[PDB]
Nucleic acid binder design. Structure first.
Lengths: 336, 170, 107, 336, 336, 108, 107
DNA sequence: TACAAGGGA
């Protein structure tokens, strides 16, 4: 089961995924160059953004958070318990189990049947060479193009400076000689209307990549190395991992910032066979593009279920209107 | 050199133009080697007569007599192409500077000099041709091309030979 | 004079022990007409220092020695006066031929 | 079936087809020199680009993915199911079929009979010498010239640093004592309007290159080593392989980057008989050249069909408007 | 008919006609030395080029491709159907027809009557010693002199290295002992504005070299060994072979490179008689040279028809403003 | 005028070891400076990292970096205005970029 | 020299001692694309003048130098002849280069 | 490197 979600969301007072200035009182958000038509030829502009690697890490965090409560949650790595995404790193032979057992770095089938995190998000074992591509692909989050055009520049990244109070046992602040660390560090914050185009394929859950189909008697029999109940639990957990994505658990500095989050609109397409990925909501004319993509792909012979959040998406297209992202994930899991 | 039915025979004559004595002529006599029936298949670079004489002069160490006396070489070839014997090469260049460059080329050592030339001749025939052209006409790029062709296939190209080549460049 | 060290550094990019085979840089620097292209070629050749040092450290053999800054300025201070390309050619080919020496680095 | 595809697509914040970084923590994106006319005289500029080899690999991946569902999908290499692009490397005599059967490499007719991937994308076995040229031609992806003109380069790239967190059971970063891997790598991301072109010579599928024709009674006729159903099935498999490239499945680092990848404009031509290759979309003045080519080629009497997307193409040429790429491939598959 | 074509064709990111040797890796492209002015003493520069042998082979391929569809396509060599250029190699004294018939290489008349490829492109039979000069000649693809002078030699080449992803069935990248083709290799891609010149001599097709005339009624009647319809079909196929010529089918590595073409300007002359060759487009002042050539050849008393694309020429003489190379060949075939 | 050595020494701090800061981006951007404006911008990004390096050198027990003097900046400015030829601009660009990679003994 | 003074004032913002680091204003000055953007950039650069002016005497080192009226009016006059960003970028980077120089502010 | 063409007793 492969599902694509793409839409526009509103961010305010966010300091998510900064470069990191270093150690002198300055932290600044990551910025990337994007191209816009701006009715004067294509031009390049710097805008704040959050990388898709961090979004994938947060999806891993959500999946491991929602997978512990499952009865089959013991088949997991303890490294995922502390929300660490190291997987196997460099120069590692045995991966310890959350139950305390150990798993060899070879026999990919054993790895995927014992560790669900590596089964879903992939892994890498340079010592032997076992590999597995991620089943969830994350895209960059960028401010939408029409917002950039209609904001006429006017850089909206604001630098808020604030101090780290260090009061000594005598109630005074001195210098480095007396052992006092008084500093005033600055953090950047941004606002705007961003877009997301998360895509995730769940048809290879529990299926080793080195042997997807068995061909017992020249029939397409999937090579499942785990129990069907465990596979269903894993796919349901991976699907419900989207709950914190569109609620406000994306970004760093959540303890001190917790960005003002709201979902403006989105469109989701779900199916079983391979389907074209939806166009990102960054562009102005993405709703019509997705409408055409759905309309002609349905006529081509693909069984696709379409869900929309307050988007008309044209007419004569069978789509379900969902009032929330959690409603959409409930609709996605009811058909599993 | 045989190469099946046909046969290439390269014949050289060494000629003075100014003055010679007995000792010089016996030094020239030492160059002659009896029964040069090389045949074989791996030693196929005996075609391209200039390469064949370079190979012959590689293993000849009679004397470096002509570094003080002027001498010339007259060469010709004989062919057995389908039992059709004729002479198809009569170019007349000299012999002094080639062996002079070889002799200034081999001061540093022989263990990495003779095998160097042999490997470049056997493996990089095009590289050997570039090297011999560079020796004949003193062009800088020839040495670089020969060294690159040698290194590409199997030649070690030690440091001392590089230093000797640089000293030859001056 | 300050040619052996740059020769070793350039040969570090050609030896089989370094399975990277950067022949484009040496071919470009060998075929140089005037100052700008040879300077760009030598810059590109010396830009590959971090990967060479990391590969040498991971292999176990001693890391390559980058040419010292003391003779780095020597290249410049000798090269501006070479207005004629002809006398520039001898050094442009000397560096290339020194780049192809054995230079046993990792035993 | 001879098909030519050309057009322009906008990519934002993509790291597709990097250079791997060699043996350095820095990771470089591939650069190449391109020629720009300009009003001051011809110049050469370094721009990011995508090699055609990886595009061909993704096309093969899409082809095998769409061919698995086909009932004739058993005639596939075992390596194809794992997306292993290598085909009959040095030192191997036989091939392993998808069902586990062994296929000899001494006959090209059998090879194309029971190996669809070798039939479409060609193959080469250096030992036995059997050979077949690929039926798919992919061109390099370069930014369009006028984009380089007004954008005047700006280096079109940004560098983003990502950390590698290695937290042990005790929660320590470690420093050269516990074998930690809490390092810091970086990636390069580019953007701009690029051009693409693809050639599909789907006229030799199931036909050995040695004996294209039979000449039973001096009457030319195709020499097909398989039933026409299998040839047709491979035809629509190749046609539908275009879908998971124009949807966003082009390039590497999909799990972390997933390029935004909007399709701007395109022009397609299709014919039964041989046709000249369509002009690539890199050049600014390519619409008029393609229009003239199509008009004067149709004047020659060639039975060709032209599809346009976001291209006027004039009025003299009879072309059918298309709204999406899958609509285009549907139109292609209607006329077998 | 006698036709001469000369012009300039743009090109970028092309790995065409490389040496491909020099050990095992680093496929490095072919180059040639050319003499230029550079406002000083004549200087020789080292630039990428394409050998005319490749152009001749591709012209043969195009001629075969456009000649199979003709009703006279049976009169063709068996090797031609395979695009094999080994025209009467060592040892053999007979050739195989397309339908399986055999022909003895004894007299030129029978060879040119029954075999079409050996007619247009000539042939050599060492055993019988038969000779026939090819009727098509091509020059090298050299970059134009003014472009070389203006770019001041940035080496006009780039090196792109890429690997094979040959992996074992177990999913691990084995070492050399295990057996794995995971290896790196590099390719050289060139760019720039190139000039070309190709000359055809279709006035002698179907005429044996030994006896061009027969002199029955005391006039030099050409010795046409085949029917006039077959000769016309051969001429039109040879002309139409130029349609895929200037479209992207003159280079190697088409499966991974597919060089990007756009013919910027050219001139063609046709006078069905002995005509001097035009000036190659490599020289920067070839426009005026060709203009003088055509105008004073017309004034001399020869009937030359001139077709021009994107050149002002002299605007005082009858020249057809052709807009495409295939439009040009349509004009050529409409006057046969 | 000797300021080339100083600016190259400063740029060498962006690639060298014992620093954990490897910004090949700015060094390559300065190296490939086709025009003067992007060269000046690359120099600006190179200088923008001065506080981090000058703090961390003392933080890691290393001598302070040789930050270019204002006279060097004035020389760089003047030379960029009387040099409008791309030919000399390219050679000067590679001249100050070449010093970045060397065997500098920043930390004894 | 009518530009060294404003550069010195900008360098006064970020330097050794002087515990008020404002990199945002310097970047805005350097990154500015339109001449007005340069205007607000220099405006926020100047608005911190009283800060340093009264804080310099808090530690005893000599007070900094505030740009004179003639130079700032001359910059204002140079503003309205740059019709293209091509010279605007070079002007902005020239102004912002002196910020990170080795200035002896107050020993 | 394929073919021819040659020098003599």
């Amino acid at each position: 089961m492969y599902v694509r979600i793409s839409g526009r969301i509103r961010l305010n007072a966010h300091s998510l995924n900064a470069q990191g200035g270093g150690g002198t009182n300055y932290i600044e958000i990551t910025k990337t160059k994007v191209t816009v038509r701006t009715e004067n030829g294509w031009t390049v502009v710097e805008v704040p953004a959050i990388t898709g690697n961090m979004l994938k890490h947060w999806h891993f965090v959500g999946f491991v958070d929602y997978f512990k409560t499952t009865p089959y949650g013991v088949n997991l790595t303890e490294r995922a318990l502390r929300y660490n995404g190291t997987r196997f790193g460099q120069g590692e032979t045995t991966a310890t189990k959350a139950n305390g057992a150990t798993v060899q770095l070879n026999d990919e089938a054993t790895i995927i049947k014992e560790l669900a995190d590596a089964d879903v998000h992939g892994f890498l074992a340079p010592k032997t060479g076992r590999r597995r591509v991620s089943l969830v692909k994350a895209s960059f989050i960028l401010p939408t193009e029409d917002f950039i055009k209609e904001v006429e520049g006017e850089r909206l990244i604001t630098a808020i400076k604030h101090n780290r109070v260090d009061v000594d046992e005598k109630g005074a602040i001195g210098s480095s000689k007396e052992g006092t660390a008084q500093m005033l560090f600055s953090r950047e914050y941004a606002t705007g209307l961003y877009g997301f185009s998360i895509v995730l394929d769940l048809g290879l859950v529990g299926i080793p990549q080195g042997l997807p189909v068995k061909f017992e008697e020249n029939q397409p029999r999937p090579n499942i190395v785990i129990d069907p109940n465990e596979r269903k639990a894993r796919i349901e957990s991976a699907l419900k991992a989207l709950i914190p994505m569109l609620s406000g658990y994306i970004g760093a500095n959540l303890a001190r910032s917790f960005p003002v989050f709201k979902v403006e609109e989105l469109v989701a397409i779900a199916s079983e066979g391979p389907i074209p990925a939806l166009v990102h909501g960054f562009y102005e004319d993405y709703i019509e593009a997705n409408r055409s993509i759905i309309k002609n792909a349905r006529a081509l012979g693909f069984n696709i279920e379409v869900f929309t959040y307050n988007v008309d998406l044209g007419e004569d297209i069978e789509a379900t209107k969902v009032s929330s992202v959690e409603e959409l994930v409930a609709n996605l899991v009811k058909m599993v | 050199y045989a190469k099946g039915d046909t046969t290439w025979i390269h014949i050289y004559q060494i000629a003075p133009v100014e003055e010679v004595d007995m000792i010089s002529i016996l030094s020239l006599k030492d160059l002659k080697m009896h029964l040069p029936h090389y045949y074989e298949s791996n030693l196929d670079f005996l075609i391209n007569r200039r390469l064949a004489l370079l190979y012959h002069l590689l293993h000849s160490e009679a004397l470096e007599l002509f570094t003080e006396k002027e001498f010339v070489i007259h060469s010709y070839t004989l062919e057995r192409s389908g039992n059709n014997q004729a002479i198809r090469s009569f170019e007349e260049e000299e012999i002094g500077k080639l062996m002079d460059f070889l002799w200034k080329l081999k001061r540093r050592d022989f263990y990495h000099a003779i095998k160097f030339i042999d490997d470049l001749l056997k493996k990089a025939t095009e590289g050997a041709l570039a090297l011999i052209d560079a020796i004949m006409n003193e062009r800088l790029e020839g040495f670089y091309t020969a060294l690159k062709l040698g290194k590409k296939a199997g030649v070690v190209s030690s440091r001392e030979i590089v230093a000797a080549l640089e000293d030859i460049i001056c | 004079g300050w040619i052996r060290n740059i020769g070793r550094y350039l040969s570090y990019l050609v030896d089989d022990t370094f399975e990277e085979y950067a022949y484009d840089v040496v071919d470009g620097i060998a075929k140089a007409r005037t100052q700008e292209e040879l300077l760009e070629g030598v810059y590109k050749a010396l830009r590959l220092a971090p990967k060479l040092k990391k590969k040498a450290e991971s292999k176990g053999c001693p890391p390559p020695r980058i040419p010292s800054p003391e003779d780095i300025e020597a290249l410049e201070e000798k090269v501006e006066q070479l207005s004629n390309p002809k006398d520039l050619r001898k050094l442009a080919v000397s560096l290339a031929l020194w780049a192809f020496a054995s230079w046993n680095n990792c035993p």
